[PDB]
Amino acid sequence: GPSVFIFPPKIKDVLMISLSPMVTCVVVDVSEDDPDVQISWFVNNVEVHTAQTQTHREDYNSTLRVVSALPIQHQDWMSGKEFKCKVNNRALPSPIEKTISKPRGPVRAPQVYVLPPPAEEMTKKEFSLTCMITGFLPAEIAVDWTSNGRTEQNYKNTATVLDSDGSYFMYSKLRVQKSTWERGSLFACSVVHEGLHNHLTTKTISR
Amino acid sequence: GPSVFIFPPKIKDVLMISLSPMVTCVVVDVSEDDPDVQISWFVNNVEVHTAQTQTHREDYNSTLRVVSALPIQHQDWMSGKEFKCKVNNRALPSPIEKTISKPRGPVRAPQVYVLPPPAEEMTKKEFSLTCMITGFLPAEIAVDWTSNGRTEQNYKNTATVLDSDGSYFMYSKLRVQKSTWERGSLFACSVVHEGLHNHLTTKTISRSL
Ligand SMILES: *[C@@H]1O[C@H](CO)[C@@H](O)[C@H](O)[C@H]1NC(C)=O
Ligand SMILES: *[C@@H]1O[C@H](CO)[C@@H](O)[C@H](O)[C@H]1NC(C)=O
Ligand code: NA
Ligand code: NA
Ligand code: NA
Ligand code: NA
Ligand code: NA
Ligand code: NA
């Protein structure tokens, strides 16, 4: 029978004013036999009408998937409003309702350090800069690297890890060519998180 | 109906001759209407009778789960022998078999580095040491720390992550007391991997003396 998953906005979309956060309801395992699904949306129990809906056939398994995305405003998310989708379909005994909201909770800024390559690695052609990001709450975060305003396309983030502290940590590893490092370039680890002034901090390292 | 999952040994158990590596067959969704499950085990097609087999009740769901763990020899795993469990039940249209072995593939030793802590952190009462582990293949690795030669408790590991050259990396973070660090205590990140000589390396750090 059909199931419904509700998704919050991406952290970066809600913490940066130029972006476009979305709350999304996804209805999965809609039978070919009962294909018609009615989705309706609510913000603090007031019905709203701006959601964009798409329907995908999954012919291979005789099902369909319906995706409904509500475009939201950053302040409504940050102030705690409840976003609710109600899903109706003839194969359900009653409508399924899913709700989501920003959980109220403690907020700890991460400490962010950019660490140079180890001495033992300098003898190589390329090597690893480490962005260490510790002590943050809640777990939602975004971490990216740039150089001279160019997004580097060769870094890897670890998954976030719960520290024995109650807080979370992660690391991001940037691979850099020796030549780029020796010509004096600035590498910037930028971290987006609820704790940070203007929701953003950027730490830079070079030779 | 019932289904079967097979699991490999933990890498630390296999790489260390004092420990007891197991290969495990788990049978889920066994109906309490046909509760009896027979598991047999084979190592390159020869039947072995050393496994320990338990049944856990899941009465909330009128189901059972059967866990059969076969204690294996370290060299059978490492040399690529096939471990196989055959599962028989009354309600099964026919016996289910699962097989597992260690894939043959290239082996690249981990590069292990303990990163020196920033000065701002060392003035605090408690701070973090970071062990960075890169370029290893295969993914299976065990990482921990010692202080003065005794295995530490207060550390956390990241998951391994696939790097862009086809090797893996990870990081390990140990929490350290300033008072212990100032005492000149030795801190060591210990790494177990099949690519290392004697399957172990250590990298150490302490206060400047
Ligand atoms: C195929 O569809 C059924 C629903 O009719 C669902 O229960 C099952 O998970 C689907 N299979 C896969 C492999 O996604
Ligand atoms: C309850 O029993 C059925 C088998 O009859 C099983 O497939 C199902 O997964 C069980 N539900 C859970 C959550 O274990
Ligand atoms: Na909210
Ligand atoms: Na580094
Ligand atoms: Na540089
Ligand atoms: Na076999
Ligand atoms: Na094997
Ligand atoms: Na290994």
Residue numbers in the entry:
A (entry chain B): 237 to 443
B (entry chain A): 237 to 445
Report text from the authors:
FcγRs bind IgG through the invariant homodimeric crystallizable fragment (Fc) formed by the C-terminal halves of the gamma heavy chain. Mice strains express three IgG2 subclasses: IgG2a, 2b and 2c that share 74–80% primary sequence identity in the hinge and Fc regions with greatest similarity in the receptor binding Cγ2 domains. With this expression and NMR technique we investigated mouse antibody fragments and characterized differences in structure and function between mouse IgG2b and 2c Fc. Here we demonstrate that mouse IgG2b and 2c have similar Fc structures for the complex-type N-glycoforms, however mIgG2c Fc binds FcγRIV with greater affinity.
Attempts to crystallize mIgG2c in both the full length and truncated N-glycoforms provided diffracting crystals. A model of the mIgG2c Fc truncated to a (1)GlcNAc N-glycan revealed substantial differences in the Cγ2 conformation and the DE loop. Beta character of the E strand extended by two residues which pulled the (1)GlcNAc residue of the truncated mIgG2c Fc upwards relative to mIgG2c with a full-length N-glycan, displacing the DE loop by 5.0 Å and shifting the BC loop by 1.5 Å for residues D269-P271. Glycan truncation likewise impacted packing of the D strand against the E strand to form a beta sheet. This is evident from the carbonyl of D295 that is in hydrogen bond distance (3.0 Å) of the S298 amide. The truncated mIgG2c Fc glycoform also formed hydrogen bonds between E268, R293, and D295 further stabilizing the DE loop by coupling it to the BC loop. The (1)GlcNAc residue and N297 sidechain rotated 180° relative the position found in mIgG2c with the full-length N-glycan. The low B-values (46 Å2) and resolution of this region are surprising; the same (1)GlcNAc residue of hIgG1 Fc with the same truncation does not reorient, is less resolved and is characterized by higher B values (105 Å2). This comparison in conjunction with the NMR data above indicates that mIgG2c Fc contains a sequence motif that provides more interactions to stabilize this critical region than are present in hIgG1 Fc, however, the rearrangements upon truncation, including the extension of the E strand, likely do not promote receptor binding as mIgG2c is more sensitive to glycan truncation than human IgG1 Fc (50-fold and 11-fold reduction, respectively).
